[PDB]
Amino acid sequence: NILKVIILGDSGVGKTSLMHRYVNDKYSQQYIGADFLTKEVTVDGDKVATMQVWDTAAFYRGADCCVLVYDVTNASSFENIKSWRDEFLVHANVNSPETFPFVILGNKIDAEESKKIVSEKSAQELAKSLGDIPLFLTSAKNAINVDTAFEEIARSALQQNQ
Ligand SMILES: Nc1nc2c(ncn2[C@@H]2O[C@H](COP(=O)(O)OP(=O)(O)O)[C@@H](O)[C@H]2O)c(=O)[nH]1
Ligand SMILES: [Mg+2]
């Protein structure tokens, strides 16, 4: 019952912060020897699993979902999302590249409007173009939508693991 989730994206977008929000429900501006952190996945009563979250911080062996993160205030980080999808696929040796699941997170949605660079339309259009990859806008800092996004990351990983 072990789900292996990898998080990729440019330095600075909030990958580490997203993991800490999901695993420990905390954020510090001030935020190791562990290749991954674990969190129990809880469902509608239902069924349970352990998620391993691997931060960029054998690595690819057994991945069940890959999360691609950009920062809505950093245009280059968004322009590199397809490159990260492709980097994963050209190195991870997944069983079925056609169906392996990705999820895209556009982080720092708490930022003031004046600092946001990437539109929601632009990101929806890219996520569609790459194969209808699910897209979530998030804030690790303010606890906006990280729960919703990881519910889909966990669902995706459960499907792929089984
Ligand atoms: N405003 C805002 N800043 C964030 C958010 N998530 C991370 N950051 C900041 O962005 C910087 C990079 O975060 P980090 O998690 O280290 O990014 P990584 O390099 O992708 O692991 C740190 O200064 C964070 O505190 C967020 O949701 N909102
Ligand atoms: Mg980091």
UniProtKB/Swiss-Prot annotation:
Keyword annotations of the record: Endosome, GTP-binding, Isopeptide bond, Lipoprotein, Membrane, Methylation, Nucleotide-binding, Prenylation, Protein transport, Transport, Ubl conjugation, Vacuole
Its membrane topology: Lipid-anchor
A GO molecular function held by the record: GTPase activity
Key word Protein transport present: yes
Residues binding GTP: 11-17, 27-31, 107-110, 139-141
Biological process according to GO: cytoplasm to vacuole targeting by the Cvt pathway; endocytosis; macroautophagy; piecemeal microautophagy of the nucleus; protein localization to vacuole; regulation of protein-containing complex assembly; regulation of vacuole fusion, non-autophagic; retrograde transport, endosome to Golgi
Effect of gene knockout: Endocytosed alpha-factor accumulates in late endosomes.
Regulation: Rab activation is generally mediated by a guanine exchange factor (GEF), while inactivation through hydrolysis of bound GTP is catalyzed by a GTPase activating protein (GAP). YPT7 is activated by GEFs MON1-CCZ1 complex (MC1) and VAM6/VPS39, and inactivated by GAPs GYP7 and GYP1.
Effect recorded for T138P: Reduced nucleotide affinity leading to increased turnover between GDP- and GTP-bound states without the need of a guanine nucleotide-exchange factor. Suppresses the zinc, caffeine and calcium sensitivity of CCZ1 mutants
Function: Ypt/Rab-type GTPases are key regulators of membrane trafficking and intracellular vesicular transport. They act as molecular switches that convert between GTP-bound and GDP-bound states, and regulate virtually all steps of membrane traffic from the formation of the transport vesicle at the donor membrane to its fusion at the target membrane. In the GDP-bound state, Ypt proteins are predominantly cytosolic, solubilized through the interaction with a GDP dissociation inhibitor (GDI).
Protein name: Ypt/Rab-type GTPase YPT7
Organism: Saccharomyces cerevisiae (strain ATCC 204508 / S288c)
